[PDB]
Tab-separated table of all heavy atoms in Angstrom:
chain	number	residue	atom	x	y	z
B	87	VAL	N	-2.471	39.821	15.127
B	87	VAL	CA	-2.926	40.317	16.477
B	87	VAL	C	-3.102	41.844	16.462
B	87	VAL	O	-4.025	42.385	16.859
B	87	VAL	CB	-2.207	39.767	17.655
B	87	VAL	CG1	-2.540	40.485	18.938
B	87	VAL	CG2	-2.271	38.201	17.715
B	88	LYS	N	-1.947	42.424	15.879
B	88	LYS	CA	-2.069	43.965	15.792
B	88	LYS	C	-3.310	44.436	15.072
B	88	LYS	O	-4.021	45.318	15.616
B	88	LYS	CB	-0.660	44.398	15.091
B	88	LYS	CG	-0.558	45.970	15.203
B	88	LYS	CD	0.624	46.493	14.344
B	88	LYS	CE	1.981	45.771	14.649
B	88	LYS	NZ	2.624	45.927	15.976
B	89	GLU	N	-3.550	43.789	13.942
B	89	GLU	CA	-4.718	44.242	13.148
B	89	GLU	C	-6.008	44.027	13.891
B	89	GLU	O	-6.853	44.905	13.955
B	89	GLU	CB	-4.645	43.495	11.838
B	89	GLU	CG	-5.809	43.695	10.852
B	89	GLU	CD	-5.698	42.901	9.612
B	89	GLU	OE1	-5.370	41.637	9.687
B	89	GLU	OE2	-5.827	43.413	8.523
B	90	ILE	N	-6.198	42.847	14.469
B	90	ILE	CA	-7.372	42.533	15.249
B	90	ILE	C	-7.648	43.565	16.418
B	90	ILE	O	-8.756	44.015	16.589
B	90	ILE	CB	-7.319	41.113	15.824
B	90	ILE	CG1	-7.574	40.189	14.553
B	90	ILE	CG2	-8.395	40.855	16.850
B	90	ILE	CD1	-7.146	38.677	14.837
B	91	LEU	N	-6.503	43.866	17.214
B	91	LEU	CA	-6.662	44.732	18.313
B	91	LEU	C	-7.037	46.219	17.912
B	91	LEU	O	-7.810	46.892	18.538
B	91	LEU	CB	-5.428	44.754	19.167
B	91	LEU	CG	-5.207	43.394	19.900
B	91	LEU	CD1	-3.907	43.401	20.622
B	91	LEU	CD2	-6.347	42.911	20.849
B	92	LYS	N	-6.323	46.622	16.894
B	92	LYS	CA	-6.483	47.976	16.324
B	92	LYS	C	-8.003	48.190	15.838
B	92	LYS	O	-8.602	49.111	16.241
B	92	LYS	CB	-5.583	48.211	15.103
B	92	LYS	CG	-4.148	48.604	15.492
B	92	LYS	CD	-4.043	50.001	16.067
B	92	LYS	CE	-2.596	50.352	16.413
B	92	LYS	NZ	-2.553	51.376	17.411
B	93	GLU	N	-8.485	47.148	15.103
B	93	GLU	CA	-9.925	47.199	14.610
B	93	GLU	C	-10.724	47.156	15.858
B	93	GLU	O	-11.765	47.960	15.923
B	93	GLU	CB	-10.170	45.967	13.701
B	93	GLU	CG	-11.729	45.949	13.350
B	93	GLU	CD	-12.086	44.570	12.799
B	93	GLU	OE1	-11.285	43.619	12.719
B	93	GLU	OE2	-13.206	44.510	12.296
B	94	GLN	N	-10.534	46.243	16.924
B	94	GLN	CA	-11.370	46.307	18.059
B	94	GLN	C	-11.456	47.603	18.829
B	94	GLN	O	-12.475	48.013	19.342
B	94	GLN	CB	-10.956	45.120	18.972
B	94	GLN	CG	-11.874	44.948	20.090
B	94	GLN	CD	-13.250	44.255	19.755
B	94	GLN	OE1	-13.581	44.254	18.536
B	94	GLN	NE2	-13.942	43.653	20.716
B	95	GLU	N	-10.279	48.211	19.055
B	95	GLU	CA	-10.235	49.499	19.738
B	95	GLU	C	-11.039	50.570	18.882
B	95	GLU	O	-11.730	51.363	19.518
B	95	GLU	CB	-8.801	49.794	19.846
B	95	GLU	CG	-8.458	51.253	20.477
B	95	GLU	CD	-7.007	51.465	20.552
B	95	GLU	OE1	-6.215	51.300	19.557
B	95	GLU	OE2	-6.584	51.802	21.637
B	96	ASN	N	-10.783	50.461	17.574
B	96	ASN	CA	-11.342	51.515	16.732
B	96	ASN	C	-12.919	51.458	16.796
B	96	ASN	O	-13.596	52.516	16.732
B	96	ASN	CB	-10.903	51.344	15.351
B	96	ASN	CG	-11.341	52.576	14.506
B	96	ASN	OD1	-11.037	53.665	14.662
B	96	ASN	ND2	-12.304	52.149	13.535
B	97	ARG	N	-13.403	50.218	16.949
B	97	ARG	CA	-14.922	50.033	16.969
B	97	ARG	C	-15.458	50.116	18.390
B	97	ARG	O	-16.721	49.953	18.510
B	97	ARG	CB	-15.321	48.753	16.218
B	97	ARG	CG	-14.900	47.538	16.867
B	97	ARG	CD	-15.270	46.314	16.091
B	97	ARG	NE	-16.772	46.120	16.103
B	97	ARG	CZ	-17.318	45.352	17.063
B	97	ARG	NH1	-16.729	44.798	18.054
B	97	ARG	NH2	-18.713	45.320	17.038
B	98	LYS	N	-14.612	50.469	19.342
B	98	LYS	CA	-15.051	50.630	20.775
B	98	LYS	C	-15.581	49.271	21.291
B	98	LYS	O	-16.608	49.159	21.977
B	98	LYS	CB	-16.091	51.705	20.952
B	98	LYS	CG	-15.506	53.043	20.584
B	98	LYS	CD	-16.360	54.288	20.815
B	98	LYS	CE	-15.595	55.493	20.524
B	98	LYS	NZ	-16.390	56.726	20.226
B	99	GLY	N	-14.874	48.170	20.935
B	99	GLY	CA	-15.163	46.905	21.460
B	99	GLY	C	-14.180	46.578	22.583
B	99	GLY	O	-13.023	47.091	22.624
B	100	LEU	N	-14.644	45.760	23.563
B	100	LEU	CA	-13.847	45.279	24.710
B	100	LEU	C	-12.648	44.467	24.254
B	100	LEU	O	-12.707	43.675	23.458
B	100	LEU	CB	-14.785	44.515	25.647
B	100	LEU	CG	-14.203	44.151	27.032
B	100	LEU	CD1	-14.003	45.396	27.871
B	100	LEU	CD2	-15.177	43.179	27.753
B	101	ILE	N	-11.515	44.824	24.954
B	101	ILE	CA	-10.250	43.951	24.910
B	101	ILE	C	-9.857	43.625	26.367
B	101	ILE	O	-9.830	44.533	27.338
B	101	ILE	CB	-9.035	44.911	24.267
B	101	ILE	CG1	-9.431	45.161	22.814
B	101	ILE	CG2	-7.785	44.072	24.274
B	101	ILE	CD1	-8.470	46.186	22.080
B	102	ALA	N	-9.637	42.348	26.504
B	102	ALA	CA	-9.397	41.820	27.841
B	102	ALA	C	-8.017	41.089	27.854
B	102	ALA	O	-7.833	40.180	26.955
B	102	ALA	CB	-10.518	40.930	28.343
B	103	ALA	N	-7.161	41.367	28.765
B	103	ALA	CA	-5.817	40.713	28.796
B	103	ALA	C	-5.414	40.463	30.259
B	103	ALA	O	-5.586	41.244	31.037
B	103	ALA	CB	-4.921	41.642	28.113
B	104	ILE	N	-4.777	39.335	30.478
B	104	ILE	CA	-4.375	38.903	31.824
B	104	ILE	C	-2.870	38.440	31.897
B	104	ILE	O	-2.351	37.846	30.937
B	104	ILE	CB	-5.332	37.788	32.294
B	104	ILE	CG1	-5.063	37.303	33.782
B	104	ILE	CG2	-5.294	36.574	31.396
B	104	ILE	CD1	-6.214	36.607	34.438
B	105	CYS	N	-2.299	38.833	32.993
B	105	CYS	CA	-0.989	38.332	33.429
B	105	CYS	C	0.086	38.999	32.571
B	105	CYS	O	0.320	40.208	32.912
B	105	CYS	CB	-0.894	36.757	33.456
B	105	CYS	SG	0.291	36.170	34.615
B	106	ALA	N	0.862	38.316	31.810
B	106	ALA	CA	1.733	39.046	30.695
B	106	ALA	C	1.004	39.510	29.458
B	106	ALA	O	1.466	40.309	28.726
B	106	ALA	CB	2.902	38.165	30.433
B	107	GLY	N	-0.308	38.957	29.281
B	107	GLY	CA	-1.116	39.359	28.228
B	107	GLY	C	-1.182	40.860	27.902
B	107	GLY	O	-1.092	41.242	26.730
B	108	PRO	N	-1.361	41.699	28.927
B	108	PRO	CA	-1.462	43.124	28.602
B	108	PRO	C	-0.149	43.727	27.944
B	108	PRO	O	-0.316	44.773	27.261
B	108	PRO	CB	-1.591	43.805	30.033
B	108	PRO	CG	-2.306	42.668	30.831
B	108	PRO	CD	-1.530	41.488	30.344
B	109	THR	N	0.975	43.061	28.055
B	109	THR	CA	2.188	43.629	27.323
B	109	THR	C	2.027	43.530	25.854
B	109	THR	O	2.680	44.387	25.051
B	109	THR	CB	3.477	42.855	27.822
B	109	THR	OG1	3.474	41.478	27.432
B	109	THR	CG2	3.677	43.110	29.277
B	110	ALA	N	1.146	42.783	25.294
B	110	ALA	CA	0.712	42.726	23.929
B	110	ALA	C	0.046	44.127	23.516
B	110	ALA	O	0.118	44.519	22.313
B	110	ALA	CB	-0.082	41.529	23.464
B	111	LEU	N	-0.719	44.592	24.440
B	111	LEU	CA	-1.352	45.936	24.239
B	111	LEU	C	-0.339	46.976	24.004
B	111	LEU	O	-0.349	47.891	23.102
B	111	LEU	CB	-2.239	46.355	25.400
B	111	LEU	CG	-3.427	45.332	25.638
B	111	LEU	CD1	-4.115	45.775	26.974
B	111	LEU	CD2	-4.289	45.070	24.551
B	112	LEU	N	0.776	46.947	24.851
B	112	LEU	CA	1.854	47.835	24.650
B	112	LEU	C	2.539	47.678	23.327
B	112	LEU	O	2.737	48.681	22.597
B	112	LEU	CB	2.918	47.788	25.819
B	112	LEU	CG	4.180	48.585	25.641
B	112	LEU	CD1	3.928	50.037	25.595
B	112	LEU	CD2	5.251	48.257	26.706
B	113	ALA	N	2.888	46.399	22.975
B	113	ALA	CA	3.448	46.135	21.647
B	113	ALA	C	2.727	46.629	20.476
B	113	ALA	O	3.317	47.210	19.491
B	113	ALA	CB	3.672	44.649	21.504
B	114	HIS	N	1.349	46.665	20.588
B	114	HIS	CA	0.507	47.052	19.469
B	114	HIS	C	-0.044	48.423	19.621
B	114	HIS	O	-0.832	48.844	18.776
B	114	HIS	CB	-0.534	45.966	19.200
B	114	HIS	CG	-0.021	44.592	18.934
B	114	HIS	ND1	1.016	44.436	17.990
B	114	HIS	CD2	-0.280	43.413	19.372
B	114	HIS	CE1	1.314	43.107	17.882
B	114	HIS	NE2	0.529	42.505	18.739
B	115	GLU	N	0.488	49.188	20.670
B	115	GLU	CA	0.069	50.538	20.948
B	115	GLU	C	-1.484	50.759	21.122
B	115	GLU	O	-2.094	51.566	20.618
B	115	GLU	CB	0.560	51.537	19.841
B	115	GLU	CG	2.094	51.425	19.755
B	115	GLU	CD	2.774	52.448	18.752
B	115	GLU	OE1	2.322	52.660	17.623
B	115	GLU	OE2	3.737	52.990	19.186
B	116	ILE	N	-1.979	49.774	21.951
B	116	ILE	CA	-3.403	49.856	22.243
B	116	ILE	C	-3.803	50.343	23.584
B	116	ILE	O	-3.151	49.994	24.602
B	116	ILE	CB	-3.931	48.432	22.186
B	116	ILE	CG1	-3.596	47.699	20.883
B	116	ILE	CG2	-5.425	48.260	22.530
B	116	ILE	CD1	-4.390	48.207	19.601
B	117	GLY	N	-4.662	51.285	23.672
B	117	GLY	CA	-5.349	51.695	24.878
B	117	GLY	C	-4.331	52.610	25.736
B	117	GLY	O	-4.489	52.630	26.956
B	118	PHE	N	-3.441	53.294	25.037
B	118	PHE	CA	-2.515	54.154	25.776
B	118	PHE	C	-3.241	55.132	26.708
B	118	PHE	O	-4.340	55.766	26.228
B	118	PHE	CB	-1.579	54.930	24.827
B	118	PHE	CG	-0.400	54.063	24.352
B	118	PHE	CD1	-0.290	52.669	24.592
B	118	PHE	CD2	0.693	54.726	23.730
B	118	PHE	CE1	0.824	51.963	24.158
B	118	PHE	CE2	1.753	53.973	23.283
B	118	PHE	CZ	1.816	52.635	23.438
B	119	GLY	N	-2.766	55.418	27.788
B	119	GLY	CA	-3.396	56.227	28.793
B	119	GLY	C	-4.323	55.559	29.813
B	119	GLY	O	-4.660	56.052	30.812
B	120	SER	N	-4.568	54.223	29.473
B	120	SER	CA	-5.414	53.521	30.352
B	120	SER	C	-4.773	53.061	31.626
B	120	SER	O	-3.543	53.033	31.729
B	120	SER	CB	-5.820	52.130	29.752
B	120	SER	OG	-6.563	52.351	28.529
B	121	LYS	N	-5.559	52.964	32.759
B	121	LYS	CA	-5.134	52.435	33.973
B	121	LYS	C	-5.239	50.822	33.737
B	121	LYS	O	-6.153	50.320	33.189
B	121	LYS	CB	-6.133	52.768	35.114
B	121	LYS	CG	-5.694	52.252	36.455
B	121	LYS	CD	-6.565	53.008	37.374
B	121	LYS	CE	-6.286	52.669	38.840
B	121	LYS	NZ	-6.141	53.968	39.585
B	122	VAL	N	-4.108	50.129	33.948
B	122	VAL	CA	-3.894	48.743	33.765
B	122	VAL	C	-3.279	48.018	34.882
B	122	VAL	O	-2.554	48.624	35.705
B	122	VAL	CB	-3.065	48.452	32.489
B	122	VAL	CG1	-3.696	49.115	31.256
B	122	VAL	CG2	-1.640	48.818	32.665
B	123	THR	N	-3.489	46.770	34.938
B	123	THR	CA	-2.634	45.899	35.821
B	123	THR	C	-2.123	44.697	34.922
B	123	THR	O	-2.426	44.519	33.766
B	123	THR	CB	-3.456	45.357	37.029
B	123	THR	OG1	-2.514	44.777	38.050
B	123	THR	CG2	-4.481	44.280	36.672
Side-chain angles (χ1 to χ4, degrees):
Chain B
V87 172
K88 190 185 310 292
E89 175 182 47
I90 287 163
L91 295 175
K92 283 289 181 202
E93 178 193 7
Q94 187 74 341
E95 173 180 51
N96 185 68
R97 67 185 290 275
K98 300 185 172 158
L100 188 67
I101 297 171
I104 185 165
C105 206
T109 66
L111 307 176
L112 175 63
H114 300 314
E115 306 188 309
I116 306 290
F118 282 8
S120 299
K121 187 170 181 130
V122 301
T123 196

